[PDB]
Amino acid sequence: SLEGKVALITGAGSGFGEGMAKRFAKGGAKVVIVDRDKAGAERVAGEIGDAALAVAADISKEADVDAAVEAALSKFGKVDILVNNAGIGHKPQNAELVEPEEFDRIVGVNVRGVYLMTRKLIPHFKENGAKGQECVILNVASTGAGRPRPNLAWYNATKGWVVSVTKALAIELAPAKIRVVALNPVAGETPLLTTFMRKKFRDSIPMGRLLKPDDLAEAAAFLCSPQASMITGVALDVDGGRSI
Ligand SMILES: NC(=O)C1=CN([C@@H]2O[C@H](COP(=O)(O)OP(=O)(O)OC[C@H]3O[C@@H](n4cnc5c(N)ncnc54)[C@H](O)[C@@H]3O)[C@@H](O)[C@H]2O)C=CC1
Numbered sequence: 030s031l032e033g034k035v036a037l038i039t040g041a042g043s044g045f046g047e048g049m050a051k052r053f054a055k056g057g058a059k060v061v062i063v064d065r066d067k068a069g070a071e072r073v074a075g076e077i078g079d080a081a082l083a084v085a086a087d088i089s090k091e092a093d094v095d096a097a098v099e100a101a102l103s104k105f106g107k108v109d110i111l112v113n114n115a116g117i118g119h120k121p122q123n124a125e126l127v128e129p130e131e132f133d134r135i136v137g138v139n140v141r142g143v144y145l146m147t148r149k150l151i152p153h154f155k156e157n158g159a160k161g162q163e164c165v166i167l168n169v170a171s172t173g174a175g176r177p178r179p180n181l182a183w184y185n186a187t188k189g190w191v192v193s194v195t196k197a198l199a200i201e202l203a204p205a206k207i208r209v210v211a212l213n214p215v216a217g218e219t220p221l222l223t224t225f226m227r228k229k230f231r232d233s234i235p236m237g238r239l240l241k242p243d244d245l246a247e248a249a250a251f252l253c254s255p256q257a258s259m260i261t262g263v264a265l266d267v268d269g270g271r272s273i
Pocket of ligand 1: 039040041042043044045046063064065066069086087088089114115116117118138142169170171172214215216217218219220221222225
């Protein structure tokens with residue numbers, strides 16, 4: 030289904046990104062594991078096997094993004110799918126207590142990093158689309174982008190940026206045969222969950238359980254597949270009903 034495709038996934042050394050890298054590879058994709066956590070990237074890539082390449086990079090820095098893209102193209106010759114999944118947050122707290130240094134770092138990863146990775150790959154994607162090869166950008170946002178609860182204000186707003194840029198890129202890039210979509214996950218069983226924080230979260234999800242990486246990975250695999258070739262500009266909630 031993703032056979033022949035090459036997916037570059039940021040933040041794939043852990044959590045949701047790790048689940049997507051594994052699910053995509055099981056679907057026949059080559060996967061470029063881009064993460065600032067070199068040990069996690071290498072573990073995931075080694076667990077997947079020869080279809081995975083680990084790339085250590087801080088996607089908030091332009092030089093690292095240039096190097097990660099060059100590495101992906103050297104190894105696999107093309108990139109078909111970009112998954113912007115890397116992200117950081119802040120501990121829940123009153124908004125006015127997040128100081129500018131922490132605010133700036135969160136924007137650097139969740140906003141600038143998406144901008145850098147997307148901007149660097151758009152020329153390649155346009156080349157591919159001109160050859161009749163559709164490309165997909167998938168951005169991982171959050172139910173908090175449009176359905177926030179108190180105490181995660183600046184994190185949630187970066188995910189609102191992501192949902193917005195998904196729409197804006199989608200309408201601009203559709204004639205180039207590039208689709209741009211987003212996923213809005215609810216609280217998931219990843220290492221980052223203790224930062225945004227379990228019975229209280231579970232009971233707030235109408236379907237009655239937390240999201241697991243495998244759940245989100247299936248929606249990502251569908252949206253990045255040719256079976257979704259007319260789906261673009263959407264932000265799909267994968268949340269057990271939390272956003273209703
Ligand atoms: N876990 C949850 O409850 C929810 C998470 N999200 C978003 O899902 C996405 C994946 O997060 P999780 O898997 O849960 O957390 P995670 O911490 O397990 O995985 C995030 C990975 O991105 C990497 N990362 C952070 N900054 C980076 C940078 N400059 N450059 C390269 N890699 C960087 C991290 O090293 C990490 O391996 C994130 O964007 C997160 O904001 C959205 C709402 C719910």
